[PDB]
């Protein structure tokens, strides 16, 4: 019953495009979508009422090509454009073109975006709005009393730094005026002695710099509402992995003070849309303005769950110019929400490494309680090299923080992703980590908790026994099902009568003796002298298997198995490789000779004769496993050569237009 | 003679697990399937010494009749296995597929994969442009029960794919072109 734009064009790809389209259908607005060539069958294109191609696969030639989008808007008679996040959400030029063609842009004004875009002005505006100061000092610190004056203007704690040098020599934190006077004196002597340069700089310091941000909603009428804070401290490579709302650190007083200051800033710059004011919060709950995001953010859903509000619907209502229907007093914190963005990356390499491939199977755990999934992919989706690796946002909601964290852990164990590597193992380990559960978190959490690197979950003796029992039961179940042939009158089958299965199971370079028996659906397993019972339906085809080991419920996945005895099992979010043999087979295996096994995949060679159409890598470039290195044409089939493993290009031995032959070196990887 | 008399009556399987030279090599050739163990088995009518003496060629036993040679070049062997233990385990697995004789239908065993399961991942597997290839093995894995496929001659004449699988628990033979 509320008039709104009849049709909207969503200029984005991935989960955000789908999220916006769902709201538009909910509000009755017709939708149009823009896709590159590779995204022709993507969920957003299928979801949109109409779709228009805007160009070639590279983003610069497609999403960032405004001209193609502008022609599409004219062609579709698009009333309004929603830019989502990234791409052209903050591009001034696009808004001008929309204004020229009288197309509403769903977002804030260019001046508001530009003002926050400048770091120097943004601080002057923050000071004028009386938000917690974030001063920057271009000049040099002359003496210890000038240091104290500057430290009081910036606000404590402050960091004193040498102008010359690196590695943290001549750096000191000061919490008060006396620590500043000594910190300056000591750092100047250390810098003069170490570098021959006594010049010092003073900047604010943040103990445990938790990243806490306040969502804000603005209207043309000038009314503004603050949404509750969000903690986004957990991050890898400057990219956030886990986000939660509300923060477990903020009390009702601090949170309100942050909300009021964020709205004061939004009013000072006449903001007119949903946005986010980001703060650094220290261990004493002092908070300091970092930046004011002027776009719908990726972590918006956790706020939507606690508030009960649809941010996209509100952005559309504000764009029509309809006044806000809510007052700050109407904005409550209901329950707790946690978001864990899912990526196609190897958690074990670095903390994340881009991985590419076709999703051969994909199943979201929606059936589970308190679970909402924001994705832009489906089974058969091709995670491409050209775009961000985000598979989905996985969000869980609870009445309290514990319930939200538990439903998440359960959701991550129930999430099926096959055909790419993914970060679920890391996400699942963060969510159960005792520091994360206690709320002892900072922007350094991943480096502090995993200094050596991510090695996957570490099993406690009981967990190891449970995993071994489950693997043995699965092996025995497969062996038993192998004997269930249908009736053959000519030759009746004689059931192999076995009461106990004696198995040698190798988990991590250790060999465990297991004795497994079954009765109906109950398997009794003795592992190194410990007795366990495993119960389940033993459906060997379903991707997810639910079992009960001594009354403890577990969800396990069987990723692969071989007649030899190898088996890959996803347990507690980690993939373990076990090797199961019978006792006699294990004994006889001792006479087998260890093979050379030398097979270097670093060198990439031509499989068949042809002509090199193009080469996509140069020496020193980074190549992920499964990433194309070159394309070879023969009988007009455009054969594609893929990198054997993630690495760099030591040397490229091929050039475009060269007639290569079989068994010819093409590239070298480290 | 017995091999020839049994051809098409009862399945015959040969596993070469050691040296095998001279006329003895012909009996496995007459059987339905031949499997080889890597690095410890070989097949050739004449040994390397006679080859050197007659044709003045230098070759080792592995080069002349090794498992790799007969699984990638001559098209004589159907599969190569790492060890005796691995070979025997895979042999049991393979034997599970076959009927006992030509008087019996294809074996049907207990099945858990629903026969009406959808495979949405295939809706976009085939590229529109006829100049780009895909992997038919992915389609085969998607269609068959539990994504289980016992391939025959996986490393020989790779432009075609043949193997054994199960549909609704019933053994089936898969033949497919390989655009890759």
From Swiss-Prot, chain A:
Mn(2+) 1 binds at residues 278, 291. It catalyses: propanoyl-CoA + hydrogencarbonate + ATP = (S)-methylmalonyl-CoA + ADP + phosphate + H(+); butanoyl-CoA + hydrogencarbonate + ATP = (2S)-ethylmalonyl-CoA + ADP + phosphate + H(+). Acetylated. Pathway: Metabolic intermediate metabolism; propanoyl-CoA degradation; succinyl-CoA from propanoyl-CoA: step 1/3. Its EC number is 6.4.1.3. Keywords: Acetylation, ATP-binding, Biotin, Disease variant, Ligase, Lipid degradation, Lipid metabolism, Magnesium, Manganese, Metal-binding, Mitochondrion, Nucleotide-binding, Phosphoprotein, Transit peptide. The modification Phosphoserine is found at residue 194. Residues 4-451 form the Biotin carboxylation domain. Its cofactor is Mg(2+); Mn(2+); biotin. Mn(2+) 2 binds at residues 291, 293. Residues 123-320 form the ATP-grasp domain. This is one of the 2 subunits of the biotin-dependent propionyl-CoA carboxylase (PCC), a mitochondrial enzyme involved in the catabolism of odd chain fatty acids, branched-chain amino acids isoleucine, threonine, methionine, and valine and other metabolites. Propionyl-CoA carboxylase catalyzes the carboxylation of propionyl-CoA/propanoyl-CoA to D-methylmalonyl-CoA/(S)-methylmalonyl-CoA. This is Propionyl-CoA carboxylase alpha chain, mitochondrial.
From Swiss-Prot, chain B:
The beta subunit contains the carboxyl transferase (CT) domain. Residues 145-178 are annotated as: Acyl-CoA binding. Belongs to the AccD/PCCB family. One of its GO terms (biological process) is short-chain fatty acid catabolic process. One of its GO terms (cellular component) is mitochondrion. GO terms for molecular function: ATP binding; propionyl-CoA carboxylase activity. The chain holds residues 181 to 360 of 539 of the full protein. The modification N6-succinyllysine is found at residue 68. The holoenzyme is a dodecamer composed of 6 PCCA/alpha subunits and 6 PCCB/beta subunits. It comes from Homo sapiens. Keywords: Acetylation, ATP-binding, Disease variant, Ligase, Mitochondrion, Nucleotide-binding, Phosphoprotein, Transit peptide. This is Propionyl-CoA carboxylase beta chain, mitochondrial. This is one of the 2 subunits of the biotin-dependent propionyl-CoA carboxylase (PCC), a mitochondrial enzyme involved in the catabolism of odd chain fatty acids, branched-chain amino acids isoleucine, threonine, methionine, and valine and other metabolites. Propionyl-CoA carboxylase catalyzes the carboxylation of propionyl-CoA/propanoyl-CoA to D-methylmalonyl-CoA/(S)-methylmalonyl-CoA. It is linked to Propionic acidemia type II: Life-threatening disease characterized by episodic vomiting, lethargy and ketosis, neutropenia, periodic thrombocytopenia, hypogammaglobulinemia, developmental retardation, and intolerance to protein. It is found in: Mitochondrion matrix. Signal peptide: none annotated.
């Amino acid at each position: 019953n509320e008039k709104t734009f009849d049709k909207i064009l969503v200029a984005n790809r991935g989960e955000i495009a789908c999220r916006v389209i769902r709201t538009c259908k909910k509000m009755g607005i017709k939708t149009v979508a823009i896709h590159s060539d590779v995204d022709a069958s993507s969920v957003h294109v299928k979801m949109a009422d109409e779709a228009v191609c805007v160009g070639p696969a590279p983003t610069s030639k497609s999403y960032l090509n405004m001209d193609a989008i502008m022609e599409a808007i004219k062609k579709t008679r698009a009333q309004a454009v929603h830019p989502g996040y990234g791409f052209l959400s903050e591009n001034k030029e696009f808004a001008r073109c929309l204004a020229a063609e009288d197309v509403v842009f769903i977002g804030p004004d260019t001046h508001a975006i530009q003002a926050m875009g400048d770091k120097i002005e943004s601080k002057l505006l923050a000071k004028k709005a009386e938000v917690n100061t974030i001063p920057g000092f271009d000049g040099v610190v002359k003496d210890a009393e000038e240091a104290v004056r500057i430290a009081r203007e910036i606000g404590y704690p402050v960091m004193i730094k040498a102008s010359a040098g690196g590695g943290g020599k001549g750096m000191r934190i000061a919490w008060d005026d006396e620590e500043t006077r000594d910190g300056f004196r000591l750092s100047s002597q250390e810098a003069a002695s170490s570098f021959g340069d006594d010049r010092l700089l003073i900047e604010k310091f943040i103990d445990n710099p938790r990243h806490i941000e306040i969502q804000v909603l603005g209207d043309k009428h000038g009314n503004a509402l603050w949404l509750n804070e969000r903690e986004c401290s957990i991050q890898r490579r400057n990219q956030k992995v886990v986000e939660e709302a509300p923060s477990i650190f903020l009390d009702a007083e601090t949170r309100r003070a942050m909300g009021e200051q964020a709205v004061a800033l939004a009013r000072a710059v006449k903001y007119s849309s949903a946005g986010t004011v980001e703060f650094l919060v220290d261990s004493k709950k002092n908070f300091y303005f970092l930046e004011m995001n002027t776009r719908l953010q990726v972590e918006h859903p956790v706020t939507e769950c606690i508030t009960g509000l649809d941010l996209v619907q509100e952005m559309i209502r504000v764009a029509k110019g309809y006044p806000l229907r809510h007052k700050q007093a109407d904005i409550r914190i209901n329950g707790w929400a946690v978001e864990c963005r899912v990526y196609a990356e190897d958690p074990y390499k670095s903390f994340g490494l881009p991985s590419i491939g076709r999703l051969s199977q994909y199943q979201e755990p929606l059936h589970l309680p308190g679970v909402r999934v924001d994705s832009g992919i489906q089974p058969g989706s091709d995670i491409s090299i050209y775009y961000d690796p985000m598979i989905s946002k996985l969000i869980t909601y609870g009445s309290d923080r514990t319930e939200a964290l538990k439903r998440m852990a359960d959701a991550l164990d129930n999430y099926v992703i096959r055909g790419v590597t993914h970060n679920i193992a890391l996400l699942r380990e963060v969510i159960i980590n005792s520091r994360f559960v206690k709320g002892d978190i900072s922007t350094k959490f991943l480096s502090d908790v995993y200094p050596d690197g991510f090695k996957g979950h570490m099993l406690t003796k009981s967990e190891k026994n449970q995993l071994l029992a489950i693997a043995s039961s699965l092996f025995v179940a497969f062996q038993l099902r192998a004997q269930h042939f249908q009736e053959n009158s000519r030759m009746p089958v004689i059931k192999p009568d076995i009461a106990n299965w004696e198995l040698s199971v190798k988990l991590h370079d250790k060999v465990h003796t297991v004795v497994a028996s079954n009765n109906g659906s109950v398997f009794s397993v003795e592992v190194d002298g410990s007795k366990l019972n495993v119960t389940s339906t033993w459906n060997l085809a379903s991707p997810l298997l639910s079992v009960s080991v001594d009354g403890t419920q577990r969800t396990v996945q069987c990723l692969s198995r071989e007649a030899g005895g190898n088996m890959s099992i996803q347990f507690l979010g980690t993939v373990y490789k076990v090797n199961i043999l019978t006792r006699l087979a294990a004994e006889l295996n001792k006479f087998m000779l260890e093979k050379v096994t030398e097979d270097t995949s670093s060198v990439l060679r031509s499989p068949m004769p042809g002509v090199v159409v193009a080469v996509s890598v140069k020496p020193g470039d980074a190549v992920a496993e499964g990433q194309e290195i070159c394309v070879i044409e023969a009988m007009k089939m455009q054969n594609s050569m893929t990198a054997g493993k993630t690495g760099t290009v030591k040397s490229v031995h091929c050039q475009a237009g060269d007639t290569v032959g079989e068994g010819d070196l093409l590239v070298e990887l480290e | 003679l017995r091999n020839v008399t049994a051809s098409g009556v009862i399945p015959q399987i040969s596993l070469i697990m050691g040296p095998c030279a001279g006329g003895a090599v012909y009996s496995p050739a007459l059987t339905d399937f031949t499997f080889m163990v890597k690095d410890t088995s070989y097949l050739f009518i004449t040994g390397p010494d006679v080859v050197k003496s007659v044709t003045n060629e230098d070759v080792t036993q592995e080069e002349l009749g090794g498992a790799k040679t007969h699984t990638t070049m001559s098209g004589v062997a159907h599969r190569a296995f790492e060890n005796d233990v691995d070979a025997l385990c895979n042999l049991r697995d393979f034997f599970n597929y076959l009927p006992l004789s030509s008087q019996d239908p294809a074996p049907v065993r207990e099945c858990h994969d629903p026969s009406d399961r959808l495979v949405p991942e295939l809706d976009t597997i085939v590229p529109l442009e006829s100049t780009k290839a895909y992997n038919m093995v992915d389609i085969i894995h998607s269609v068959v029960d539990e994504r289980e496929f016992f391939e025959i001659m996986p490393n020989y004449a790779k432009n075609i794919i043949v193997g054994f699988a199960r549909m609704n628990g019933r053994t089936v033979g898969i033949v497919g072109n390989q655009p890759k």
